[PDB]
Structure formats: C-alpha cells, structure tokens
Design goal:
The structure is cut from a larger assembly and holds two copies of chain A.
Chain A (H helix, E strand, L loop, with lengths): L5 H9 L34
PDB class: viral protein
Keywords: SARS-CoV-2, virology, class I fusion proteins, S glycoprotein
Entry title: Cryo-EM structure of a prefusion stabilized SARS-CoV-2 Spike (D614N, R682S, R685G, A892P, A942P and V987P)(S-closed trimer)
Chain lengths: 48, 48
C-alpha cells in the first residue's frame, strides 16, 4: 500500500520490496488550502 | 606565487516537474499522466 507509511511509499517509488540503505525523495509535500474565498465588487444593478 | 582557480561544484537544484508543468491543477496532472515517465526521468537526472 503506497500510502500506508513512508517505507511503503519508498518501496512504491523504487518499485521494489527491498530498499537499500540511503535517502530517497518519494513525494512532494505542500500545504492544502483551508477554505475558499470570493472577492467580487459590491455591485447590485442587473445588466440591461 | 601564482593562482589557479578551478570550479569544483555548482548549485544543486531540484524541480518538481509536475508542479512546473501543472502547478496545482489536477486536470493538467491527469492529462500529464499520459506522457508516461518523463517527469521521473527528469527528477532522476537532476538528483544524479
């Protein structure tokens, strides 16, 4: 399972069940958005 | 006494191919999946 734990993710990245001693970059972390925002101008009159 | 200047190393760079190409879009990511393993090759080369 590639998303169980870092070792399994490494095994999937290398596509192997044995991992040699070393350091491997398996993925990329990035913060996810907390909420969405909409900022439109305060306009009310409907277009004719 | 004379000087000899020799470069030994240069800057170690990494590029998240899937983020340079598709910043955070998942449509673009799903569409880039069908190019195979170009991104993995590029990251492998830069890591080397």
């Amino acid at each position: 399972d590639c998303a169980l734990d870092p070792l399994s993710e490494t095994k999937c990245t290398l596509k192997s069940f044995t991992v040699e001693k070393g350091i491997y970059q398996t993925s990329n972390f990035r913060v996810q958005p907390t909420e969405s925002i909409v900022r439109f101008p305060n306009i009310t009159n409907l277009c004719p | 006494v004379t000087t000899e200047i020799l470069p030994v190393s240069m800057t170690k760079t990494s590029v998240d191919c899937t983020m340079y190409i598709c910043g955070d879009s998942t449509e673009c990511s799903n569409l880039l999946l069908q190019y195979g393993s170009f991104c993995t090759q590029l990251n492998r080369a830069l890591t080397g």
